Amino acid sequence: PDPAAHLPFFYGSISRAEAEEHLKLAGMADGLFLLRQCLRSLGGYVLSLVHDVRFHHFPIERQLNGTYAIAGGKAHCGPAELCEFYSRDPDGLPCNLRKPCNRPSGLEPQPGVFDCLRDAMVRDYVRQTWKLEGEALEQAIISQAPQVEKLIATTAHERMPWYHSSLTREEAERKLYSGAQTDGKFLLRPRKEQGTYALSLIYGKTVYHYLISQDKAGKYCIPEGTKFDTLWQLVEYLKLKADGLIYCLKEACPNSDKPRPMPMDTSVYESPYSDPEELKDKKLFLKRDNLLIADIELGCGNFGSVRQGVYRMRKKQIDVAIKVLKQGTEKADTEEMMREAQIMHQLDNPYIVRLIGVCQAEALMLVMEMAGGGPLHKFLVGKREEIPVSNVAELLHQVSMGMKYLEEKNFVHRNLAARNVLLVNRHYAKISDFGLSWPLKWYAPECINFRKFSSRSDVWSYGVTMWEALSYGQKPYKKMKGPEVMAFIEQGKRMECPPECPPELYALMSDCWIYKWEDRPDFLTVEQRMRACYYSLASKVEGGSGLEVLF
Numbered sequence: 001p002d003p004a005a006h007l008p009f010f011y012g013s014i015s016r017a018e019a020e021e022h023l024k025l026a027g028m029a030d031g032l033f034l035l036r037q038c039l040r041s042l043g044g045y046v047l048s049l050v051h052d053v054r055f056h057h058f059p060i061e062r063q064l065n066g067t068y069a070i071a072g073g074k075a076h077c078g079p080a081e082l083c084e085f086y087s088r089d090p091d092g093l094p095c096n097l098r099k100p101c102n103r104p105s106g107l108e109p110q111p112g113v114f115d116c117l118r119d120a121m122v123r124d125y126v127r128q129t130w131k132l133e134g135e136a137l138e139q140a141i142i143s144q145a146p147q148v149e150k151l152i153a154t155t156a157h158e159r160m161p162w163y164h165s166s167l168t169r170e171e172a173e174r175k176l177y178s179g180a181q182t183d184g185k186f187l188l189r190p191r192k193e194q195g196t197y198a199l200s201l202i203y204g205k206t207v208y209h210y211l212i213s214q215d216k217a218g219k220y221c222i223p224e225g226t227k228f229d230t231l232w233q234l235v236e237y238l239k240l241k242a243d244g245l246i247y248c249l250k251e252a253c254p255n256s257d258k259p260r261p262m263p264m265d266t267s268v269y270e271s272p273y274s275d276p277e278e279l280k281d282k283k284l285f286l287k288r289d290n291l292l293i294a295d296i297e298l299g300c301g302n303f304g305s306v307r308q309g310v311y312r313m314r315k316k317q318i319d320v321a322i323k324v325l326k327q328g329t330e331k332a333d334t335e336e337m338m339r340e341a342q343i344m345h346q347l348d349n350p351y352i353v354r355l356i357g358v359c360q361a362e363a364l365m366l367v368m369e370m371a372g373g374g375p376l377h378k379f380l381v382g383k384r385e386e387i388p389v390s391n392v393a394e395l396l397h398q399v400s401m402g403m404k405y406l407e408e409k410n411f412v413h414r415n416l417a418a419r420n421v422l423l424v425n426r427h428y429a430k431i432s433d434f435g436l437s438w439p440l441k442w443y444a445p446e447c448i449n450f451r452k453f454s455s456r457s458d459v460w461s462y463g464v465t466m467w468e469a470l471s472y473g474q475k476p477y478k479k480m481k482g483p484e485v486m487a488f489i490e491q492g493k494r495m496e497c498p499p500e501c502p503p504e505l506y507a508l509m510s511d512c513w514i515y516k517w518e519d520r521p522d523f524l525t526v527e528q529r530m531r532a533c534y535y536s537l538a539s540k541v542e543g544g545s546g547l548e549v550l551f
């Protein structure tokens with residue numbers, strides 16, 4: 001995720017002529033400006049502007065600690081910031097930024113090599129760290145991209161299999177001719193000159209050596225000149241672009257609680273039935289003998305009582321959460337519940353609480369995954385200082401991804417609220433209580449008005465859920481109740497934009513509250529939109545208390 005991908009004046013990987021072109025068409029007015037990618041430095045941009053009808057191009061280097069600055073200028077926490085600052089203070093520039101050269105309608109930034117490099121490295125960090133695949137992997141990427149990128153830049157080259165901490169030119173030469181003499185086979189070693197390294201590669205059965213040089217900035221360099229923040233990136237980039245090399249890198253000559261928790265560090269990120277064998281025998285109805293129901297309760301709600309337990313599986317014992325439906329069948333509606341549970345037993349997403357199965361004994365029991373973190377709204381109460389706006393944006397994201405999935409499968413969650421989003425940890429939220437057939441504050445009108453439950457109705461309560469989240473647990477439509485809102489709503493009257501909730505996110509939960517359920521968007525759009533916002537927030541520096549902040 002590029003931090004400057006939301007800014008409508010950012011054009012991605014384009015040349016100078018292209019930039020200068022767009023700038024013509026827009027007037028040439030003094031203070032007109034755009035931002036684009038820098039082709040020869042990883043993470044950098046180029047600030048281009050028009051002063052006295054002449055173009056000015058300012059390279060913006062991405063420093064090591066994450067800050068961005070024009071050479072010899074002030075450092076910023078990011079592009080957005082950088083461009084707001086120079087809008088009200090030229091500070092060295094010819095004039096102050098004035099009119100963004102907003103991108104024309106329908107265009108989006110043009111993907112560059114670094115983008116592919118970034119998205120690719122990400123995909124492989126996860127793939128290898130958590131041996132994840134299928135949507136499982138697609139889903140851990142979408143939500144955790146931002147965090148991975150940060151882990152990537154902190155991953156020491158010493159750790160990599162292609163780095164050899166104490167080889168000399170000849171030793172290097174020696175080793176390489178020792179194994180398979182394929183083209184592209186390579187290693188990297190530390191030079192005498194501190195902060196210098198060598199890239200030894202095999203081509204046409206000959207070892208070639210390239211010097212890697214570091215900056216006063218601390219960046220890393222191919223004598224070709226392209227600049228990277230770490231060796232791993234450099235190396236990973238040279239398997240793609242052969243610039244300045246006899247040949248590109250291929251195979252690697254081989255070598256010999258956490259601060260910030262991730263969603264896939266958990267046991268519940270992936271379905272219990274993903275062990276092929278465990279999957280083979282996936283009964284909707286569970287035996288009561290393989291169930292251990294604790295006497296003490298996790299909580300209690302309108303629907304029933306929730307008790308922690310543990311379930312015996314073919315090869316493992318899993319922590320489960322049991323909900324005891326307060327209400328049983330009455331009439332052979334029993335199956336109809338069965339019919340449903342059958343549909344829920346299918347839904348598989350890392351961001352929803354999964355149905356392990358059901359079990360009937362003393363009571364009808366809903367056996368589900370263990371998200372013992374307690375619900376969203378409570379978790380956020382009075383934690384405005386402790387839990388940054390980005391970390392909330394991240395949990396709202398995960399919820400969107402769950403509803404996205406649920407939408408996909410033509411499944412309506414009807415009881416969507418903060419109270420129905422349960423944290424596994426501070427960065428991992430799961431949606432729950434989806435098929436359970438004042439709590440009418442979340443319901444879009446047409447549910448109340450016509451009992452019409454669509455995913456478009458869910459889209460409403462999401463906007464409601466967003467409000468609760470972005471205002472740290474505060475009740476919604478406090479000052480009201482029942483028809484009080486029904487009327488309050490009928491008249492284009494909406495909830496307020498909680499303090500310090502960005503414009504985009506409000507404008508979002510707002511579109512969620514468009515009376516005509518048709519004119520309202522679908523989750524596909526929401527998660528899409530929710531993503532950009534989240535991403536721009538996360539790519540920055542991190543707020544809050546704890547120990548994950550020291551990292």
Ligand SMILES: Nc1ncnc2c1ncn2[C@@H]1O[C@H](COP(=O)(O)OP(=O)(O)NP(=O)(O)O)[C@@H](O)[C@H]1O
Binds near residue numbers: 372432
């Ligand atoms: N799978 C679970 N894992 C751990 N705790 C849970 C789980 N499901 C529910 N709980 C607990 O029970 C509380 C919520 O009660 P629940 O029975 O889910 O109904 P509710 O959110 O209060 N209202 P409603 O779903 O609208 O009837 C939460 O605060 C949780 O602590």
Ligand SMILES: [Mg+2]
Binds near residue numbers: 301
């Ligand atoms: Mg609940």
